[PDB]
Amino acid sequence: QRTGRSALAVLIRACYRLQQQLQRTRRALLHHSDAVLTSLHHVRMLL
Amino acid sequence: EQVVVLQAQRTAAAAALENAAMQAAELPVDIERRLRPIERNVH
Amino acid sequence: ATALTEACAAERVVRPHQLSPAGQAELLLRFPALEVPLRHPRPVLPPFDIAAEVAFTARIHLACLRALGQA
């Protein structure tokens, strides 16, 4: 009973967190990349 | 009067590019260290 | 420096005097320091510029030329 039910919990903790790791890379690469577009629009404001 | 303004504005944003060029030089960096600890994770 | 660019980047406007008054009043609610460069008739410096000092020494230079040639 404890052999098959706990060995799958290895792959439970892996799959539900890889769903979470790619969500931060959606956010942290848009809250960083918009600063680039913030900087480039600022340079045109100087001109 | 306008030349003294128009010249100083052009030399201004010339400096702001190199602040942005060192700022936008991390985009080929910032993609690499986010994918590679997930590729070895799958592999 | 974050808000004054993004409020103009959302509207595709190069100078914050050309911003819509619906957008201009939003910055005044958050940031009350922007009263004078937004709601003043004749500022001695040109507001929201970069050579605004550099314009200022060039205007006294002109005013001292016409003080000579008229006299």
Side-chain angles (χ1 to χ4, degrees), chain C residues 3-4 24-39 48:
Chain C
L4 290 174
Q24 292 178 358
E26 183 179 0
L27 294 174
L28 293 174
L29 294 174
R30 294 179 66 189
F31 292 155
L34 296 172
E35 192 273 331
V36 176
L38 288 173
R39 299 292 297 163
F48 293 99

Side-chain angles (χ1 to χ4, degrees), chain A residues 2 13 31:
Chain A
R2 293 179 181 177
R13 293 181 182 177
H31 294 287

Side-chain angles (χ1 to χ4, degrees), chain A residues 37-38 41-42 44-47, chain C residues 4-6 8-9 13-14:
Chain A
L37 292 174
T38 302
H41 181 76
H42 179 72
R44 188 183 177 183
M45 188 179 287
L46 268 73
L47 295 175
Chain C
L4 290 174
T5 61
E6 293 178 353
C8 294
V13 178
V14 67

